[PDB]
Ligand binder design. Structure first.
Ligand SMILES: O=C(O)CNC(=O)C(=O)O
Ligand SMILES: [Mn+2]
Length: 214
RNA sequence: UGGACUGC
């Protein structure tokens, strides 16, 4: 109710990438999945889950079960130079478009993470670690349409999700920017019922200078 | 039937 308007103030969203531009980027995402299957990336570049894969370029992070002590501020960057560099196509096809459209300043993005969701995949509600990433947070969706939900309570065995404070549809080719309240004081997630087809999203962030590393 | 928030 009153919190939903607080979330809306920190959301920017627009259809930035055309259908032709999405197809070219989605072919590059298929190249990343192929190299990961062939084991051509560094070990910490690929993070696999039952219905979701994360591909860390520039800077990666540990999360969830990878944390020995589960708590705020426990996420860590990987050692310097551990994960693979940002691919050239990410700079030219995605980051350059965002910089030229003034979504984020030039030289802001130093971390590009690709999330590849199989049908029915999800990601549990979370705040992007405040001790790791600066604000704002940019994400570009591909392959299919879906939604981003805020303030959801996850329960498991089996996975049940509560009603979101706000549901934001993320259409294919759209850019989502999170700032202020929507990025710091409320979690965001993806519910399994929002992934009907394969969906990939490229999240582009800047890590803090004092971000702790492994 | 696929798990970042108990930051309750
Ligand atoms: O698909 C999305 O936008 C959700 N992804 C995240 O919140 C994340 O990887 O940190
Ligand atoms: Mn996130």
């Amino acid at each position: 109710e009153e919190e939903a308007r607080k979330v809306k103030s920190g959301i920017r969203q627009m259809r930035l990438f055309s259908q032709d531009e999405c197809a070219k980027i989605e072919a590059r995402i298929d190249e990343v999945v192929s190299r990961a299957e062939k084991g051509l990336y560094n070990e910490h570049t690929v993070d696999r889950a039952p219905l979701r894969n994360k591909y860390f370029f520039g800077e990666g992070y540990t999360y969830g079960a990878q944390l020995q002590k589960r708590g705020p501020g426990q996420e860590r960057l990987y050692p310097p130079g551990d994960v693979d560099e940002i691919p050239e196509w990410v700079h030219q096809l995605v980051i350059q478009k965002l910089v030229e459209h003034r979504v984020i300043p030039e030289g802001f993005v130093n971390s590009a993470v690709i999330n590849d969701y199989q049908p029915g995949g999800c990601i549990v509600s979370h705040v992007d670690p405040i001790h790791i990433f600066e604000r704002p947070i940019v994400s570009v969706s591909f392959f299919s349409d879906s939604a981003l939900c805020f303030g959801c309570k996850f329960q498991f065995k089996p996975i049940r999700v509560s009603e979101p404070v706000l549901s934001l549809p993320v259409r294919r080719g759209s850019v989502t920017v999170l700032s202020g309240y929507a990025a710091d004081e409320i979690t965001h997630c993806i519910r399994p019922q929002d992934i009907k087809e394969r969906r990939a999203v490229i999240i582009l962030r800047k890590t803090r200078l004092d971000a702790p590393r492994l």
